[PDB]
Design a protein around this ligand. Structure first.
Ligand SMILES: CCCCCCCCCCCCCCCCCC(=O)OC[C@H](CO[C@@H]1O[C@H](CO)[C@H](O)[C@H](O)[C@H]1O)OC(=O)CCCCCCCCCCCCCCCCC
Ligand SMILES: CC1=C(/C=C/C(C)=C/C=C\C(C)=C\C=C\C=C(C)\C=C\C=C(C)\C=C\C2=C(C)CCCC2(C)C)C(C)(C)CCC1
Lengths: 611, 42, 488, 39
């Protein structure tokens, strides 16, 4: 049956890429001119994976218990290492999300990539991405949530640096790799600690052993807390949360399909995915849930504040998705396990729609700047309508899914620690503002400066269907999402969000559509907080000043010590045994009488210390 | 269960020897198209 | 078998001086056939290699007047490295096709140091060990001084001087342990089964250390490495960086953990802090260095710290992490320095800021070099990460081991800094102007791609299912560490 | 030295005084740690 060849899911795409990789290295010209059949081959592989995952998801919602099939990977005398797969319902959900988004985006990128070199290497990278993340999801243990959690990082390095002809992509890829290696430093120390203390890594025994040990002594209270925030320092890098957020928007120098996978709930979700599968390390530690929550909250306020003053559409959606990841991490912090993943399962669809629509408009712009693209929708009906739907999703207007997601999380934040409410609330207002000036500046008005495919547009509709219909698996009258995903009246609270969103959309309508206030003179006047938040909260300059200079100076501080204080000391040995020879030969002077001296006077000292 | 390297090696190394002798013939840049040098790095 | 393995390359090398030619072509095929036949002898003598001790040892008697015996012996701890040298020196010869300057001497010295590298592992006599350790000097000296580099004078001279003056206490130490009692042993086993007092255990240990810490360069005992690995062509370098450092590590294991365990237990913290110093030091000195080759040499110096930590641990896992790191770096650095040699051959330049965007026309070396660079750092799916992870786990499982892990994991951040900065400086960006008018090398002739593909298959096969390489020495390392814990 | 002329362009790092008070820190660091390790 199924559940035996579940390991087959990462292998088909990988294999595809592998073959195509051997086709890009050997037989380069053929596979470079063999564009579309390789594409649909990789697509068939991902489609088999998608059908397999869908059948698993159906067999798991219908009813079954999890089926893990592990194997011993690295062995030694007493201890062991396990590396296999488990299929719990959360894994199946994330699996189907990954597969569907990857299939649709692969079809999209069949059209996004015009006559262009690198049409097959792209799909090779993208199938490797599929394998990597699909293998990350199916993971009983934590060591396997580092292997693929870094394979996805290198694949992001590759995809960002697709256009290696350019210079900005190289720096962006280097940055987005190094920041994730900081995250790896964190999670690696956390793993080595959780193995040092407990003696196993399975996400369930790791909690039983921790609560058992803390019931006794042998480590407490901050000796189980230091190696629990290090684990969280991985998601901070991979889910773009504060303070490791600078890598995500600069990764937008890469293509749009890429930026739609690795900014949907496919890669950055991995962070919160980890936080889902580690609550049996965090639930028995209320000293770090608070840290996680306020981290997510400050991230939300950050991404909401920066995106307003931006003018580049893609680089604005970057801070938007940072903010939404912040909402999810907030929900993870204060208790909620089955409400952060609802926003995840909703955010893997409308944000991808927005990125794909951005790719469509920037492709139909012969750039990238909202200020130089005025009223479209005279030629972009489908893209504009679906962008509008995804824009409604990330704000109020309750029939759409993002309200049903950003009501549960807000309710959880209100019942527990309502001080963190009233900041998230205005932040939702800021979402409603920037996402609708992203529309009124872009798809409505007069086309200021100076037309839509088919393959590029079907995915947007196929994702618009979820983004309007996902909200109805929440809805706390017949809630099915919380029962299928479990951890091991309300109008006064909900309608406030819709009212604040109406405030935001109204302030956006009267300000960019016609502009009866002064969008320029509100920032070309006394107010300096347009410069701030357009220099993106100087963190970038801060790191480039204090940190990148630090190692770059310390390297010389060490290397001259190496080339002078270490090397010169031993070369001095050769110098000494050279000058000794140069100065001792003068004993030999070319005089027989000097030998007559130091022959018999050379001895007669040998008699003095003799008798 | 456990997998052993012995038949893997026995199956790979003849292919390695044959492909080594084969790709020894396949060459290029070093012959005439460029590279007046002599493989010394001076 | 081992005697045939060691003597057939050397004996067949003595035929090269009387071997027809018109320009220099039929020498390299002969050398490659010799290397391939000998590798076949390795892997065919590996069929009858069961997997605890010397699974085959063929002793003889040359000089009974001293105690010298031609005691070859394979082992779980020495057979992977024998395979490694038999594979990687063959691929060095399969990389040295364009050698036109004095090819007879090239393919004689290369075959001489092909038996001079299998012998150091397939030897159990402490005098013949010294002989084989020593006979790497003149061949490497000529390999560096004739072809390869402008500073090759200072490099080769410094190499031979340091690897003679620190090939110095190995004999002294073998003697110092040979005549403690009333038996003229000169044999690994018979001399490991002797009770050595602490008063000179930790003196003979330092004698071994001054030797095994210059070839496995530790804190200042490295300054020969940048000069000898910078002024060196690729196929020379593959040997010099993939086998000899492993020779130091192997001999360190077998002479300081089976044979002086009581002093090992007292000095191991030194090796540990030295290893993390090695990592951070080499990584900073690599990110500072700008040329192209010295960078990767310091990267090797960085990667050896995992070996120091894994040997200076005391569990059954750190040792395997060390050996796995060794077999990993032997496969990684070889491809790295091969690609560096190729890139120099196409550009006739090493310096980074003097070239950029070369990956627009020379867009075959860029992929291979990116892959080997990802393999250098502790990337999962490869053997470079399995070693690091096993080192961390095994060490922490055993200097209050929470600070040294924190300092050794800095390499995880600090390796991609200079590697990816090197990639950015070389291959990314817009093509240079006519300042680079060397005609960007016709992207890696299939013959280079085969080299790196056959170096890049075993590494992935290890990184996915590492037991392939660990099935070899689970028994031997188990016995070694059982002994070293039985003392304590 | 004069070879290290790149983005690595810190001026006050090649002088003998700064090299001395850098080697002091590095040697004292390894020495504090070797004393921490033995004891
Ligand atoms: C039986 C077990 C099976 C398991 C095997 C597991 C290993 C899996 C390996 C899968 C490798 C998939 C990647 C394939 C992409 C190759 C792309 C290529 O060769 O481009 C080669 C391209 C060829 O260039 C392409 O084709 C034409 C060539 O003329 C065009 O002109 C353009 O160059 C471009 O279209 O080279 C370049 O021009 C650009 C190079 C860009 C840099 C790519 C380096 C990527 C290397 C990643 C390798 C990671 C593998 C290690 C990680 C292992 C993870 C387990
Ligand atoms: C010989 C030998 C060995 C080996 C063995 C083993 C370990 C094996 C395994 C094997 C296996 C188990 C296999 C696997 C396979 C895989 C593959 C097949 C993949 C990869 C490859 C390829 C595909 C490549 C390609 C490329 C290039 C070349 C460049 C870059 C890009 C790419 C990556 C694409 C050892 C080490 C012991 C030692 C020495 C000798």
């Amino acid at each position: 049956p199924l559940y035996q060849y579940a390991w087959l899911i990462p292998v088909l795409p990988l294999l595809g890429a592998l073959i195509v990789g051997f086709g890009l290295i050997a037989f380069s010209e053929t596979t470079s001119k063999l564009r579309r059949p390789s594409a649909i081959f990789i697509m068939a592989l991902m489609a088999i994976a998608m059908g397999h995952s869908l059948t698993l998801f159906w067999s798991q919602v219908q009813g079954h218990l999890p089926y893990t099939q592990m194997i011993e990977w690295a062995a030694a005398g007493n201890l062991h290492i396990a590396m296999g797969y488990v299929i719990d319902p959360l894994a199946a959900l994330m699996l189907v999300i990954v597969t569907t988004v990857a299939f649709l985006v692969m079809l999209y990128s069949d059209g996004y990539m015009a006559h262009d070199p690198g049409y097959v290497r792209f799909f090779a990278y993208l199938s490797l991405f599929g394998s990597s993340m699909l293998g990350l999801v199916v993971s009983p243990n934590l060591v396997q949530v580092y292997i693929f959690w870094e394979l996805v990082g290198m694949c992001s390095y590759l995809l960002i640096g697709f256009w290696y002809d350019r210079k900005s992509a190289a720096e962006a890829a280097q940055k987005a790799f190094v920041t994730n290696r900081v995250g790896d430093f964190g999670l690696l120390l956390g793993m080595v600690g959780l193995f040092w203390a407990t003696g196993t890594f399975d996400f369930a025994g790791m909690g039983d052993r921790l609560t058992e040990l803390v019931n006794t002594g042998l480590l407490s209270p901050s000796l189980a807390a230091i190696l629990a925030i290090l684990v969280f320092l991985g998601p901070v890098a991979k889910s773009a949360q504060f303070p490791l957020h600078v890598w995500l928007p600069d990764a937008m120098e890469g293509p749009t399909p890429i930026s739609a996978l690795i900014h949907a709930a496919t890669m950055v979700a991995a962070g919160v995915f980890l936080i889902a599968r580690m609550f049996p390390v965090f639930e028995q530690l209320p000293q770090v849930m608070t840290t996680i929550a306020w981290t997510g909250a400050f991230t939300a306020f950050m991404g909401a504040t920066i995106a307003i003053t931006q003018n580049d559409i893609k680089k604005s959606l970057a801070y938007s998705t940072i903010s939404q990841l912040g909402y999810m991490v907030m929900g993870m912090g204060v208790g909620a396990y089955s409400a952060g993943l609802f926003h995840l399962m909703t955010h893997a669809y409308f944000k991808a729609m927005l990125f794909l629509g951005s790719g469509s408009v920037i492709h139909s712009m012969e750039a990238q700047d909202m200020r130089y693209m005025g009223g479209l929708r005279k030629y972009m009906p489908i893209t504009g309508a679906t962008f509008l739907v995804g824009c409604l999703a990330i704000s109020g207007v309750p029939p759409f899914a993002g309200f049903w997601s950003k009501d549960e999380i807000l309710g959880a934040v209100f019942h527990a620690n309502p001080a963190m409410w009233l900041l998230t609330w205005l932040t939702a207002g800021l979402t409603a503002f920037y996402m609708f000036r992203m529309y009124f500046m872009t798809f409505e008005g007069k086309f200021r400066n100076v037309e839509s495919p088919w393959t590029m547009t079907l995915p947007l509709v196929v994702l618009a269907i979820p983004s309007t219909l996902i909200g109805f698996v929440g809805t706390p009258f017949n809630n099915l999402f919380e029962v299928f995903i479990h951890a091991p009246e309300f109008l006064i609270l909900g309608g406030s969000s819709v009212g604040i969103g109406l405030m935001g959309i109204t302030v956006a309508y009267l300000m960019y559509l016609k502009g009866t206030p002064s969008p320029q003179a509100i920032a070309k006047a006394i107010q300096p907080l347009y410069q701030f938040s357009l220099h993106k909260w100087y963190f970038d300059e801060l790191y480039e000043a204090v940190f990148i200079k630090g190692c770059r100076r310390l390297a010389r501080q060490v290397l001259e010590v190496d080339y002078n204080v270490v090397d010169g000391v031993v070369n001095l040995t050769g110098f000494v045994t050279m000058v000794t020879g140069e100065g001792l030969k003068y004993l030999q002077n070319g005089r027989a009488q000097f030998y007559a001296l130091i022959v018999l006077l050379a001895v007669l000292g040998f008699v003095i210390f003799s008798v | 269960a456990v997998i052993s390297v012995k038949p893997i090696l026995l199956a790979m190394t003849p292919v390695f020897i044959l492909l080594c002798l084969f790709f020894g013939t396949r060459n290029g840049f070093y012959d005439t198209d460029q590279y007046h040098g002599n493989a010394a790095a001076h | 078998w081992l005697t045939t393995i060691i003597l057939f390359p050397i004996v067949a090398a003595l035929a090269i001086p009387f071997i027809p030619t018109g320009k220099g072509r039929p020498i390299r095929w002969y050398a490659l056939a010799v290397g391939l036949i000998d590798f076949a002898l390795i892997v065919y003598a590996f069929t009858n290699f069961y997997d605890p001790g010397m699974q085959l040892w063929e002793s003889y008697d040359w000089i009974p007047e001293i105690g010298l015996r031609w005691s070859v012996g394979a082992d779980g701890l020495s057979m992977p490295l024998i395979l490694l040298t038999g594979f990687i020196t063959t691929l060095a010869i399969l990389a040295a096709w364009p050698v036109t300057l004095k090819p007879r001497l090239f393919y004689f010295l290369m075959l001489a140091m092909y038996g001079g590298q299998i012998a150091v592992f397939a030897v159990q006599d402490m005098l013949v060990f010294f002989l084989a350790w020593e006979l790497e000097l003149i061949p490497v000296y000529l390999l560096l001084a004739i072809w390869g580099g402008h500073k090759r004078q200072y490099a080769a001279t410094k190499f031979i001087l340091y690897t003679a003056g620190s090939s110095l206490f190995i004999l002294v130490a073998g003697l110092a342990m040979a005549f403690y009692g009333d038996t003229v042993s000169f044999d690994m086993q018979t001399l490991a089964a002797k009770d050595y007092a602490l008063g000179f255990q930790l003196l003979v240990y330092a004698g071994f250390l001054v030797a095994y810490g210059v070839k496995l360069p530790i804190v200042p005992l490295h300054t020969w490495l940048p000069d000898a690995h910078g002024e060196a062509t690729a196929p020379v370098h593959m040997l010099l960086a993939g086998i000899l450092l492993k020779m130091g590590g192997y001999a360190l294991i077998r002479m300081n953990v089976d044979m002086l365990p009581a002093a090992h237990a007292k000095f191991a913290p030194v090796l540990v802090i030295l290893g993390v110093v090695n990592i951070i030091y080499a990584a900073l000195t690599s990110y500072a260095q700008r040329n192209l080759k010295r960078k990767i040499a310091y990267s090797s110096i960085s990667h050896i710290g995992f070996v120091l930590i894994g040997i200076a641990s005391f569990t059954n896992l750190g040792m395997s992490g060390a050996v796995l790191q060794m077999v990993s770096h032997g496969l990684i650095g070889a491809s790295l320095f091969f690609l560096v040699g190729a890139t120099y051959d196409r550009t006739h330049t090493l310096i980074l800021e003097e070239m950029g965007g070369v990956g627009q026309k020379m867009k075959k070396i860029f992929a291979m070099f990116t892959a080997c660079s990802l393999a250098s750092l502790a990337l999962p799916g490869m053997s470079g990460f399995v070693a690091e992870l096993m080192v961390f786990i095994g060490f922490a499982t055993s200097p209050f081991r929470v600070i040294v892990v924190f300092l050794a994991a800095v390499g995880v951040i600090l390796t991609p800094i200079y590697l990816l900065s090197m990639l950015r400086e070389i291959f990314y960006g817009p093509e240079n102007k006519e300042l680079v008018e060397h005609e960007a090398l016709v992207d890696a002739e299939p013959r280079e791609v085969f080299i790196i593909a056959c170096l890049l298959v075993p590494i992935i096969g290890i990184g996915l299912y590492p037991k392939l390489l660990t099935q070899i020495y689970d028994a031997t390392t188990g016995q070694v560490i059982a002994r070293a814990r039985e003392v304590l | 030295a004069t070879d290290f002329r790149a983005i690595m362009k810190f001026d006050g790092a090649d002088s003998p005084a700064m090299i001395a008070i850098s080697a002091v820190l590095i040697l004292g660091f390894i020495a504090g740690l070797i004393w921490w390790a033995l004891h």
